[PDB]
Amino acid sequence: ADESLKDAIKDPALENKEHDIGPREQVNFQLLDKNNETQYYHFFSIKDPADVYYTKKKAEVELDINTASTWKKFEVYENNQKLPVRLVSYSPVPEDHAYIRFPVSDGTQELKIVSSTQIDDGEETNYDYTKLVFAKPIYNDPSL
Known part of the structure; x- marks a missing residue:
């Protein structure tokens, strides 16, 4: 029952x-567009490496979105299951920053992010298929 990142960041909590x-840990991510093309000059939304809040049940990755006001939807999916990415915190317009987190079992290292952002620049950024290969496998720590 997720909603739109644009209509969800408007919360007081x-x-x-x-x-x-x-x-918590630090996990980078490989951005590819169905062509193994890594655009290292498009850092407009994400900024730092995805984080990993390992809990007692399952691991919890995290990614900060600078242009949270440009995000509209989001449906990450790996293998064959779209994980419902939720929001944990979001800075106000002047800060413009949305925080989302999702579980990752089996050391998940590759997920197809699905979303479409628009900044009123010209066309519409529709990520029909974004191959984001984490820098490493996210394995929860049941024993630590």
Whole structure:
């Protein structure tokens, strides 16, 4: 029952919450467009490497979105299951930053992000298929 990142970032509880409690790690991500093409000059939305909040049940990756005001939808899917990415915190317009997190079992290292952003520049950025291969496999720590 997810919604639109543009109509969800407007919340008082997710306007400035401390999205950093418990354990956490750093995981980069490989951006590819069905052509193994890594665009290292398009850092307009994401900025730092995806984070990994390993909990007691399953691992929890995290990705900050600078242009949260440009995101409209989002349906990441790996193998054959679209994980419902949710939101944990989002900075207000002046800060423009949305925080989303999703579980990743089996050391998931590749997921097809599905979303479409628009900045009123010219056309519409529709990511029909975004191959994001994590820098490493995300394996939860049931024993640590």
